[PDB]
Design a protein around this ligand. Structure first.
Ligand SMILES: [Zn+2]
Lengths: 1028, 94, 98, 36, 35
DNA sequence: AGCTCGATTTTT
DNA sequence: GCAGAATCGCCC
């Protein structure tokens, strides 16, 4: 059975009405796409703020009545975004800068893109779609829509039925909803003005939804793309070719020696993405716990509305590095330029990037001239990235562009220039600005652009095979410890790591490396480490014994291990931001094109173009090519998806009489029903892989991986102890003037150590020899290029260096993945001019005065030494990928794929990337403790006693049991009964009489009840024949 | 290059050469020369990036910059030395 | 099962579907545990070859010509073997057989 | 392609009566039409 | 019809046909029996 | 009446 | 500039 079969009958969508007197307008604005002067905006679908608790995201939509006595059902999930269209001026903007709507309109025309064309009717008047008696001036109005019928919403083909109203609680607010049905549920017809239409809603969808999907296919005719997606949903056209006539090609493709085959492969890849991406998006999805806004942990310490709004702004700053990476990276998914041809045979066709290519003129599928190109334009100068390229990245949408500018306001400036206040009072205030007229100089988009200028990418016209950058939610099962997926199943490497954390818990160390007791001095600092080393070395033995007795070939299984990350294919798993809708949809469309390239090439090699145009060639071949794609794209190493049949159990269902409801009368009927579609394609994950071990086989590469063995002078300060020797410096050397770095570098060259005024000399001579000894042992043995920050990472490094040595892996460093994690900080506002608002600024002295008392929130990324603990917190991720394709082994002739982790392009992305083969990076933000929520003492006494008695050998245990009881219970031991003693001793309950006789001697000898006094009394107060 | 790459290179060039003396005052003077009054709010995440390979030094740099900030001298390399330079047992090991 | 007959006769149903079904068969019948076959491209090296003048030979006169030549078909499907298997060991698992 | 059983009592007297024995007819070609 | 060149019809069939191989083990035994 | 089996090459 | 890989599931 499946989630589709289990979903209930219902409408095609809803109109929600929220009361303006009580609804939390400033909270929704922080999650919205509002610009100054808007008439519509987008917000996320969330239980407890935009829909009621218990909203069903999966439904069977009643969409057609073939006659008045039969219904047809379509299984579909909801669309991720909600569109706010009535009284939308009541929701605050996310960004204060003026003039965005005209800037978007001008820039859409120079790139040759299609603007929204309105229907010849007026928009529906409030009295047509409002419930009876509600005042239109008192409410905010918004649409929630199913993924299969959203083009029908755009085209004005839905009907609202106000008599079928339902009253619903949305957080605190008493709200109302009205259902939407497709006009095909009325076979006798309804009048054309009785259908629901809003021109501001349709224009918002054109810009914020469909234009970015057109950019992902390299199509300019957005309105024709919407028409062909509607007919594909309503008339089952998935196996019919449809996008090829809308395609356009650059001069590098038209001048190519293989141009005829390239035009067919580029066209067929786009056709397949349009066939399969909508089907996977419409499928039934799991409901994440992050969809419930009132259980979000981030609000837990908040009191009142101001604290809740300030908590949402901190939440948004933690997501900003994902959004700014997709703007600053030269190889961003937003800058994909098309397909080109060389690489090995299956890699020979590949995806290209470049904004210079995107400016050029084009030719149609019949080699005739099409778009004529744009020559380019500001403060970044000639041939460089300009504000128009940011408008192109935002799909010419003022709603998307406003939310991009809001995320860019968290970014630091990096000068490669006028002072900020002399720019804001100077050139930003000029009447020549086409955005603010100089009347809003501190928040203007041109001021933000001037500040971030040296971080934007270069403008490229080349055709090289590079990785592209993707963003989204991670899946459930990531393998990102030092040896990745090594022994993941059959003890398992997962179980080995759980055993080590249990040993570290007995030493007083938690899963994040925090101590229950900090080291007191030199002896305690040495003792702390020697116990961890002994605990790791004990677990290596028990593991190597398991591999030996089972004859497992672990020595060859190390050679083939990979790091693995899962990219989720659920649209509801993404973070609650409308920009992540576009980043997810464009990542999916790009991955489906890149997977399809060799499938199209092999079919065309067998069925050549012979001078046909792609629309002519596809007319015969496309139905067969769909079936090859379904067989060869899925379960072949990147994409996983499950096919299923959807069934409805009852022959009829309880539904309102829609003919009576159109006339205002409400009552039920048991309408006969059947499914209009049976097959569903449920998407699961996209899988990303990185190879762990370099084997020395590729002789060109060795110099990047090779392990040196000679005795360096940096061996202590670049060794395993330096971070701890710094963290504990004030406890090791009380009141010393020396830096920790100089103290240990002086020791590393002069062999001497300072002894505090009352402390003992030989205690410090031992500390020095511990540091020296372990640092030289690490210099010899280590193949993991990390300086560990905490005892858990120190322990895990020691463990994995032992396994690699047993495998004979000693000549090379292993590959590393490092996580870049956002840290949010408050700074003085002097260089962050947007805190001043739409305020007029008259002089640099007034700018300096007004900023002198103010602070700005900013974000930077910090490198973690331990990606696997971040992956346990279910992170939002951003990473580079190339999809490589290769033949099977053992004489097989099929094609298999891997999505391999690559590199970021462009020097503005992050300062930690500024200069490798052997280190790669991922950006990660955790969701546990932000949007998703994370014994009796007599059981613990009992466990600790069974742990003593099961280990004590060659001595009688009663004194060590009595000391543990006197420690845990003190004076309460004086009356310990036999029934209590027998329970606490557990398996060893036979010992009870000897324990109670011993406790009576402590009670009667008049010493106090403490473990120190118990030993002092007991330790102050044989014949043995051998047997055959 | 970005200017933060040039500050970082100049600090790694000092720390890799300074011998027989503790380097924190010579690092603090190079920061006060390159950033002036902007040192008064230098965060640990910025300080760790600028120190590069030697990021362990960051706590001692920030404790030193707070003494310049609170003693009320102006942010220049000449005043920094004039304050800092106005304001042991050692056993040998086998 | 994915493309049902819906009361069509087989010649009507095959008119739409057969070109796709050929490609499924080539992908799913070969190297899957019974039949093995190798696909190959056939090429001729020379642009002309030594052949008799067939117009003269029809009239009884015999002499040679270097006629220009090209292949009318390029793909070839070379069959190899059909494989027959028989299990050696009964493992005791199917309790009806013991 | 799993090896099976012959049907019909006229095929060969050695087949006249199992799970655990199967038969094939074989005639050699080395020393008849091909040289050793 | 005609049989192919590579048949595996000793008592354990295709057991250890490639990696010593079961074919090599049978060749060793025939050499001992020759002595 | 009459197992279960992810598959290809290798080729002695 | 920036390896190589037959693949699916399983989830302790
Ligand atoms: Zn302006």
């Amino acid at each position: 059975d499946n989630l589709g079969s289990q979903s209930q009958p219902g409408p095609c969508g809803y109109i929600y009405f929220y009361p303006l007197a009580t609804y939390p307008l400033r909270e929704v604005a922080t999650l919205g796409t509002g610009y100054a002067g808007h008439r519509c905006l987008t917000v996320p679908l969330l239980c407890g703020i935009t829909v009621e608790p218990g909203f069903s995201i999966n439904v069977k939509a009643l969409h057609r009545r073939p006659d008045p006595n039969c219904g047809l059902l379509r299984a579909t999930s909801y669309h991720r975004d909600i569109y706010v269209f009535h009284n939308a001026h009541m929701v605050p903007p996310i960004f204060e800068g003026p003039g965005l709507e005209a800037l978007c309109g001008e820039t859409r025309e120079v790139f040759g893109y299609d603007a929204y064309s309105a229907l010849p009717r007026e928009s529906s008047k409030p009295g047509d779609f409002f419930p009876e008696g509600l005042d239109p001036s008192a409410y905010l109005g918004a649409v929630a829509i199913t993924e299969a019928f959203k083009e029908r919403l755009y085209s004005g083909n839905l009907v609202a039925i106000p008599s079928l109203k339902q009253e619903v609680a949305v957080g605190q607010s008493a709200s109302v909803r009205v259902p939407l049905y497709d006009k095909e549920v009325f076979p006798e017809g309804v009048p054309q003005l009785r259908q629901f239409y809003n021109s501001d809603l349709s224009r918002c969808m054109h810009e914020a939804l469909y234009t970015g999907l057109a950019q992902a296919l390299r199509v300019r005719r957005v309105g024709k793309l919407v028409e062909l997606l509607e007919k594909q949903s309503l008339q089952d056209q998935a196996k019919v070719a449809k996008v090829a006539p809308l395609k356009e090609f650059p001069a590098s493709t038209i001048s190519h020696p293989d141009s005829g085959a390239l035009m067919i492969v580029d066209s067929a890849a786009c056709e397949l993405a349009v066939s399969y991406a909508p089907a996977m998006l419409e499928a039934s999805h799991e409901t994440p716990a992050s969809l419930n806004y009132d259980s979000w942990p981030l609000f837990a310490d908040c009191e009142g509305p101001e604290a809740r709004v300030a908590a949402l702004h901190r939440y948004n700053a933690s997501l900003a590095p994902h959004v700014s990476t997709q703007i600053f990276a030269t190889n961003s998914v937003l800058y994909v330029s098309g397909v080109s041809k060389s690489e090995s045979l299956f890699n020979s066709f590949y995806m290209t990037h470049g904004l210079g290519t995107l400016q050029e003129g084009t030719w149609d599928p019949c080699r005739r001239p099409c778009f004529s190109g744009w020559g380019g334009p500001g403060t970044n100068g000639p041939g460089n990235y300009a504000v128009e390229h940011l408008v192109y990245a935002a799909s010419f949408s003022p709603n998307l562009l406003a939310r991009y500018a809001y995320y860019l306001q968290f970014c630091q400036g990096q000068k490669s220039v006028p002072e900020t206040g002399s720019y804001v009072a100077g050139a930003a205030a000029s009447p020549m600005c086409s955005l603010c007229e100089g009347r809003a100089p501190a928040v203007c988009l041109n001021t933000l652009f001037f500040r971030l200028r040296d971080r934007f990418p270069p403008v490229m016209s080349t055709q090289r095979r590079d990785p592209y950058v993707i963003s989204g939610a991670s899946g459930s099962y990531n393998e990102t410890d030092f040896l990745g997926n090594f022994l993941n199943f059959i003890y398992t490497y997962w179980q080995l790591n759980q055993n080590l954390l249990e040993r570290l818990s007995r030493l007083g160390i938690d899963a994040e490396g925090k101590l229950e007791k900090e080291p007191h001095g030199p002896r305690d600092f040495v003792k702390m480490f020697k116990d961890v080393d002994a605990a790791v070395d004990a677990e290596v033995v028990q593991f190597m014994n398991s591999m030996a007795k089972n004859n497992i070939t672990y020595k060859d299984l190390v050679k083939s291990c990979y790091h693995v990350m899962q990219y989720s294919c659920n649209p509801f798993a993404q973070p609650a931001c409308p920009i992540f809708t576009q980043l997810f949809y464009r990542s999916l469309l790009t991955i489906l094109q890149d997977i399809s390239l060799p499938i199209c090439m092999c079919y065309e090699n067998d069925n050549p173009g012979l001078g046909q145009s792609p629309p002519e060639w596809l007319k015969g071949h496309y139905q067969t090519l769909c079936t090859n794609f379904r067989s060869l794209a899925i379960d072949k190493g990147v994409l996983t998806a499950k096919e299923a049949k959807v069934v409805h159990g009852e022959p009829t269902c309880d539904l309102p009489d829609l003919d009576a409801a159109l006339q205002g009368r409400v009552y039920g009927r048991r309408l006969p029903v059947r499914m209009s579609k049976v097959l569903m394609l449920c998407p699961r994950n996209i899988k990303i892989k990185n190879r762990v071990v370099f084997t020395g086989e590729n002789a060109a590469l060795q110099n990047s991986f090779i392990k040196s063995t000679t005795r360096r002078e940096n061996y202590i300060i670049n060794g395993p102890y330096m971070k701890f020797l710094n963290t504990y410096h004030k406890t090791l050397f009380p009141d010393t003037k020396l830096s920790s770095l100089y103290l240990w570098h002086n020791f590393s060259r002069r062999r001497s150590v300072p002894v505090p005024s009352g402390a003992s000399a030989e205690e410090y001579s031992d500390l020095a020899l511990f540091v020296d000894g372990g640092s030289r042992a690490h210099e010899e043995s280590n193949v993991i290029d990390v300086v560990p920050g905490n005892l858990v990472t120190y322990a895990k490094q020691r463990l994995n260096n032992a396994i690699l040595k047993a495998c004979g892996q000693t000549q090379f460093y292993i590959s590393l993945i490092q996580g870049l994690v956002p840290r949010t900080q408050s700074v003085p506002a002097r260089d962050y001019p947007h805190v001043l608002g739409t305020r007029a600024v008259e002089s640099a002295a007034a700018y300096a005065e007004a900023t002198s008392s103010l602070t700005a929130t900013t974000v930077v990324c910090a490198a973690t030494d331990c990606l696997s603990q971040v992956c346990k917190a279910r992170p939002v991720v951003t990473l580079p990928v190339t999809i490589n394709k290769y033949t099977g082994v053992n004489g097989n002739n099929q094609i298999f794929q891997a999505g391999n982790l690559g590199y970021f392009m462009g020097r503005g992305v992050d300062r930690n990337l500024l200069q490798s083969m052997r280190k790669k990076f991922v950006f990660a933000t955790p969701t546990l403790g932000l949007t998703v929520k994370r014994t009796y003492e007599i059981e613990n006494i009992r466990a600790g006693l069974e742990a003593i008695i099961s280990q004590k050998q060659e001595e009688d245990c009663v004194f060590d049991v009595v000391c543990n009881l006197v420690d845990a219970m003190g004076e309460a031991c004086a009356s310990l009964t036999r029934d209590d003693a027998e329970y606490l001793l557990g398996r060893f309950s036979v010992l009870a009489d000897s324990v109670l006789e011993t406790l009576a001697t402590i009670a009667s000898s008049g010493i106090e009840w403490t473990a120190e006094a118990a030993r002092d009394f007991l330790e102050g107060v044989d014949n043995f024949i051998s047997v055959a």
